[PDB]
Amino acid sequence: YVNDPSNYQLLIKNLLFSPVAFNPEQEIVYANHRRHSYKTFHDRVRQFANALTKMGVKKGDTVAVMDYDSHRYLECYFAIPMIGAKLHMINVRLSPEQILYTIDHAEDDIILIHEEFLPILDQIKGRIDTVTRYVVLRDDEECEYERLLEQESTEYNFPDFDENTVATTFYTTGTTGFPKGVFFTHRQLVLHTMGILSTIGTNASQGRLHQGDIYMPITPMFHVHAWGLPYMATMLGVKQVYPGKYVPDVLLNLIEQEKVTFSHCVPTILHLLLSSPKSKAMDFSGWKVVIGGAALPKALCKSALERDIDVFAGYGMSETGPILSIVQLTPEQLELDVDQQAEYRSKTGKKVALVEAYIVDEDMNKLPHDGETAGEIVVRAPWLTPNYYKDNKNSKALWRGGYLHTGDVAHIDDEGFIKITDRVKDMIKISGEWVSSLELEDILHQHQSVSEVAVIGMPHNKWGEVPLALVTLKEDAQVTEKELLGFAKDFINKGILAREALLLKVKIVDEIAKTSVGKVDKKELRKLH
Amino acid sequence: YVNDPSNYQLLIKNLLFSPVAFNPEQEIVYANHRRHSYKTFHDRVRQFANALTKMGVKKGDTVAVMDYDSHRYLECYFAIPMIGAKLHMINVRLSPEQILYTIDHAEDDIILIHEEFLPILDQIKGRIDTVTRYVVLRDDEECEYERLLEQESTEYNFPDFDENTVATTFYTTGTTGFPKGVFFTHRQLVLHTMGILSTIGTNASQGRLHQGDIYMPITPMFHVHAWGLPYMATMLGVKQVYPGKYVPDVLLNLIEQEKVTFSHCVPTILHLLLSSPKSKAMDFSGWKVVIGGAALPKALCKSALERDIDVFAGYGMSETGPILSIVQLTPEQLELDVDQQAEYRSKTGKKVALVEAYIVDEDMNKLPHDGETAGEIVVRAPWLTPNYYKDNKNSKALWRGGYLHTGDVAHIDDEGFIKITDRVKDMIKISGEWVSSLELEDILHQHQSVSEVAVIGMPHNKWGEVPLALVTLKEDAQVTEKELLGFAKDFINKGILAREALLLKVKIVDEIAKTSVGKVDKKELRKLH
Amino acid sequence: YVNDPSNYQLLIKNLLFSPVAFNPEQEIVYANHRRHSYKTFHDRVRQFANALTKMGVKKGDTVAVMDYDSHRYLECYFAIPMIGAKLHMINVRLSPEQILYTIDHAEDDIILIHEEFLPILDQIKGRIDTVTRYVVLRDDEECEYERLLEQESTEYNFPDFDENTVATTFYTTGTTGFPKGVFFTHRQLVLHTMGILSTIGTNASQGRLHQGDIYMPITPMFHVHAWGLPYMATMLGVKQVYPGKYVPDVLLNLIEQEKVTFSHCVPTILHLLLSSPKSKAMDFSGWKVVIGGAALPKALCKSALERDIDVFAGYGMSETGPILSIVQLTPEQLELDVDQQAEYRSKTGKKVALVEAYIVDEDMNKLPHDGETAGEIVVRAPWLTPNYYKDNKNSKALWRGGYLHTGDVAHIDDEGFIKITDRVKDMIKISGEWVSSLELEDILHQHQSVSEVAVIGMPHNKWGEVPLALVTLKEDAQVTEKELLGFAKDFINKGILAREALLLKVKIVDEIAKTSVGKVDKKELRKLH
Numbered sequence A, B, C: 001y002v003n004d005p006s007n008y009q010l011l012i013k014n015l016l017f018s019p020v021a022f023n024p025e026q027e028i029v030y031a032n033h034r035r036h037s038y039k040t041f042h043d044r045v046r047q048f049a050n051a052l053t054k055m056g057v058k059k060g061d062t063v064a065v066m067d068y069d070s071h072r073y074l075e076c077y078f079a080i081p082m083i084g085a086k087l088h089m090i091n092v093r094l095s096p097e098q099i100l101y102t103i104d105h106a107e108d109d110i111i112l113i114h115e116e117f118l119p120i121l122d123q124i125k126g127r128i129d130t131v132t133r134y135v136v137l138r139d140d141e142e143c144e145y146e147r148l149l150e151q152e153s154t155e156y157n158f159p160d161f162d163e164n165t166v167a168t169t170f171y172t173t174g175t176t177g178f179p180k181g182v183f184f185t186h187r188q189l190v191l192h193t194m195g196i197l198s199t200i201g202t203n204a205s206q207g208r209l210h211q212g213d214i215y216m217p218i219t220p221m222f223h224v225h226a227w228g229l230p231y232m233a234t235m236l237g238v239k240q241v242y243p244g245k246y247v248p249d250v251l252l253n254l255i256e257q258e259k260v261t262f263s264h265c266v267p268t269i270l271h272l273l274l275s276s277p278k279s280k281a282m283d284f285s286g287w288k289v290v291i292g293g294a295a296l297p298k299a300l301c302k303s304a305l306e307r308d309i310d311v312f313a314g315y316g317m318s319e320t321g322p323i324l325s326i327v328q329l330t331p332e333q334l335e336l337d338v339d340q341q342a343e344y345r346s347k348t349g350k351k352v353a354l355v356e357a358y359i360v361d362e363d364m365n366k367l368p369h370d371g372e373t374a375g376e377i378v379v380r381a382p383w384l385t386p387n388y389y390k391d392n393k394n395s396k397a398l399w400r401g402g403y404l405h406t407g408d409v410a411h412i413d414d415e416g417f418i419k420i421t422d423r424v425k426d427m428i429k430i431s432g433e434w435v436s437s438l439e440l441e442d443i444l445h446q447h448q449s450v451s452e453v454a455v456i457g458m459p460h461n462k463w464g465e466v467p468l469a470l471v472t473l474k475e476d477a478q479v480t481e482k483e484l485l486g487f488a489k490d491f492i493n494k495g496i497l498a499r500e501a502l503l504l505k506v507k508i509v510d511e512i513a514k515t516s517v518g519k520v521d522k523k524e525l526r527k528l529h
């Protein structure tokens, strides 16, 4: 690559080595396991670069990671892209068959896998062709990653290349035949960091991330860069605490003992934290959770506001950076009582800097922002995936009409608040994972005696939504719900179906509502059953 | 495309409309269903081109076909490539999950599916995204293909384009994680036709295909262009008989009633034909079967030679056109008795025109053709797939060292006869389908109590090879063969495993042979169990 | 050249070293002079490559050959193109001035000339500028070619280059001002070999060339690659006999003693062979002459059929590969008596694989194939010369309207038989050489007393056609035919006119038929005189 130093490229190395602030004695904490300053973190990143170079990782290679939220994942967020390689983040919560498919599709060269994820590998390790090396990670001195790092020097000259080289990739299981691969460049990640820092750092007094915070993620960190927050924290040079496996009690202990002030999670985790008996004698009045999983319910928001938690909601998705919207309260709205506060904080929010976010109908006609008309959201931003990896038709359907199609139906108020009414599909979302209703319909239709199977979604608190199934039996056929539940469970036991179908809650009916054309009225069915 | 008429492009339309011979009143026979001359066949091809154009099929589209050997498949072999589209041939004998994977990978626009293959579709139809239209085929006047054709004119001006545009694609399930996609161009298919016609038409008196033959395939016709034979027959303008579903009695009736003289099959089908009671009072002394499935056994060859059948063997594979080698007997060898004849006719044969076929060791060192030294076969020819579709690492391993790696270990005599000794892997091949030993090993290792599972292959006549499994039980564990057989069968019942594992024949042992390094001695195990 | 081994190039080296069959102990016979197997032939080709490289022949050079049909010419057909050089084949039957013109036009670097062609060189050797070396060939151990070969090793690594590099060139004296240069590429020659092998090898029982034949050419071998037959024979690995100079008695002796079964000649040579007294006590019932010079007469065909000779006719020309058409008899026509057989075998035949061959009028309007309407033949094939070397206007007239214009007027039957009625010009063809009527007209018009000279052609058996001249004398002028015959002969004695004018047969007349416009009615004159 011809440098031309006057021509500046936006790279992740500039994010690490040209931060907003850098205190060499600020800490990085891995829960009750490890602690080390920022200077040793930089040294470790350079050592990891040396180790990867020794392993034979070139500028076009892919390194896949499968582990929990820890300092090692933070080191991988930086070392692998800075060498010019591609970081493939594996969703450990997918079924083994889907995990194997994503590994084969991405063509990973090296795999860094945690010890306790080894069983999942053991039932797919035979069918993996591209992988040359496995590095097994442990939480003790026995870790292979740690032994690899300590054989290397803390010196390394990181290359400079084009800012449009791909940095990260991960696979979204949004309803389709197979998982789809998204990817982002160095430029896009740097611009996402800068834009969101501009948006949420400049807020007057509420819901701001600044250089005095202490950050602890509660998002799995293989889900779209942990909403980009680990990159931002490193940019601000703040104390970072990584909990590892999510356990409510140890999480609360970390919050108390480390004085965490900024976190992000999904509604289920927040509900679990609030329902824990250990969370009654704690001081929560310094904490700034951002809820972005799905549809922060107003009841949970009110329950959190009485604990003195600055809870606000945000909107994004796998294809969008992810962050697209955040709720910011004006100083007049900061003095409303708890009910109106809960109503405002549970909206999807206003769009962030450099985002367009129109609302459109099926003919690509921009609807008015009158506050009640609904349509699909279409966006333009500096950090959107241009297409799906190794895909053409779905890529064209993603960017139809010159805009990125989110797949969510919402209405936009006069001031700019966005409220998502539904999806453009009849799909379910159990907790933070995607599950397809059509696939469950087919699996249940493969039963011995089934007339019509239609799967709809019903709301929930510990899960957000449950995949209700409605089955009509054949002539003189009588099978209990246990039979069909076990039949569906058998598929999950083979690694075909994700574990989120373990609470399917099937229901036997005899009449199926159908439209004038005859299509199953899933909205009417939801209002019925 | 700029034509430049002086610049000649090798296209399949030139194969259809510039044949070696064209008799407008020669017949095309679909067994007991339909008969029509070559003139109506040309008219039907033009009508099918018109119908595909009306459906919106452009020059880059893919049309997938899923049916039996019939006149419709022959029409698809010509119409779809001539329009410039790509013909994806679906292997109906793969598991539904593999079929769905191949459909999604190839991104088919239209699917032409037979009526009796509908159930397989019904359990994957939900997870198909790219397909816009299904055409259901039947053997009566109710067929949708027939109704589509009769609404169109018999006039069409076929385009001329570059000869390097892709014509056909199909997926090989040779041992890997997922099926691999091969593809060929118009030029490659035309050159394969011309080269094999030159090789087998110029033979003096034995095993030749000429303009007076009557041709009937017994290869499924979705397996690598039916060895290219339907293209050759059309070039020679000979009578063609298509049997449909392979049933030994109806096949024998067609052979007798239509006076078939040239066919190709795999050893299993030939064994079934010879073992049929209807095949004792028939005159087989005009028939020229080519056996190319795998390792034509000498006993079957002798049994066929006593019926006055000109049986000879050939060698090819999915990546190679397929044809690479054919056995041709010199007039001195035509007077040997039945035993030496059977020995010679069962070899893999000499290479065909324009084929190189060296024998090499693991360091790419060309071994001598002394007749006993063995090595892997590496080939160069005008009709080899340049790589696997949407694949990089396996593509590089396929063409390592500038030659195509077959994966078969053989030795070459002084005169040029090739004899395949084994594979470069421990893989099984039940009848004409590929089955992976490693995947079965993993599935069985997922059992409640298993110590070591190793799968080897043992020979057979009705199947060619059976996938023997050797399982060592855990401490104080005793499970019968029925348990493990049913456990494996359950996976097949879910569409995960191919039906060729229904004769696994597991075996319980307590000692596993291991090398000095410790690897399971699969050859020693085969000699043991 | 960048090889890219997956990208296959069609080269003549692949024709020699990847044949249909290769028997190392098959013979090559040079009549009563030399015999050597195929292994020594390959060694000799490599030695000749080494010698040419030593002489300084690069990839763009031209080597010209002037000798008889022998093993050396066969070696030149392979060695020179395989080195990447261009083989210029000199027509030794042209006048010395025309030979010199072709040598200067082609710009040959080296000339390989036979001893007995030395006198022709001696009267033009002064005016040759480009030539650097002459190699004199003899039929004994004194030959310079033989001495050059034996100083070299039998090892050589032949290059691989683009398949569109020119391989051969030769000059056609079809009626024009000067001879025109045609040329073909490696790809075109390989495709001509494959296509004609497919066409004539797949015939059922009549007129087929197969691997058991013994081949002996009777075409001068500098006339358009000897119709491509030496390349085909080498591909089949058959015994090849080269007679040298054509003498009927030695040719018959070779046929008898070597058991020749396949040959090609022009009608004059066949007539001479049949009229020889030595040809009355011979067994001709194994021989398969192909007659392709011009218009095989039915009387000669009948006379040959009574000797049990499989005589059939073919059609081609210098610009067309040459082969365009061959007569193939269906098994129903094989049982007709001698008269209908003679009628069928004397037609020009049906077109070969990959040939289009329309019939057209002067406005490029495709006439119907009703069997009586006549028009010029226009062709498309994979082995046509794209243009004339170093020529623009004649090149454009050759490919006018997107088709190659043959210059022959024919009609095409319903089944596809082509019958050539005449030429599009008033040109003569004495035996196998072209002679221009306009040039003879001018030469005779240069006489002391001439009013109108018009040259027409009349048929013949020992010559096929004689160049009749009709001369009208001036007022009170009386010169005998001897005077004008000697005047014309004087020009031939100076090397200006070809020797085919030695039987001009001038005729003195007084009235010239003229059309309504006034043009000489050459057809009416032919019916008159």
Ligand SMILES: Nc1ncnc2c1ncn2[C@@H]1O[C@H](COP(=O)(O)O)[C@@H](O)[C@H]1O
Residues within 6 Å of the ligand: A172, A173, A174, A291, A292, A293, A294, A295, A296, A313, A314, A315, A316, A317, A318, A319, A322, A348, A406, A408, A420
């Ligand atoms: N703040 C939110 N409010 C409502 N739905 C949300 C919110 N954040 C995410 N979602 C939903 O969760 C989905 C994320 O799925 P994905 O990123 O594609 O893996 C989005 O497409 C939304 O439908």
Ligand SMILES: Nc1ncnc2c1ncn2[C@@H]1O[C@H](COP(=O)(O)O)[C@@H](O)[C@H]1O
Residues within 6 Å of the ligand: B172, B173, B174, B291, B292, B293, B294, B295, B296, B313, B314, B315, B316, B317, B318, B319, B322, B348, B406, B408, B420
């Ligand atoms: N004539 C033969 N003799 C031995 N093995 C054969 C023969 N024809 C095919 N095979 C085997 O069958 C395989 C075909 O598998 P494929 O074409 O990849 O789908 C080849 O790779 C060979 O291993």
Ligand SMILES: Nc1ncnc2c1ncn2[C@@H]1O[C@H](COP(=O)(O)O)[C@@H](O)[C@H]1O
Residues within 6 Å of the ligand: C172, C173, C174, C291, C292, C293, C294, C295, C296, C313, C314, C315, C316, C317, C318, C319, C322, C348, C406, C408, C420
């Ligand atoms: N089988 C044939 N029947 C009639 N004319 C022929 C036949 N073969 C060649 N010719 C004629 O001989 C000519 C060959 O001249 P050329 O190849 O240009 O040197 C052709 O153009 C035809 O006119």
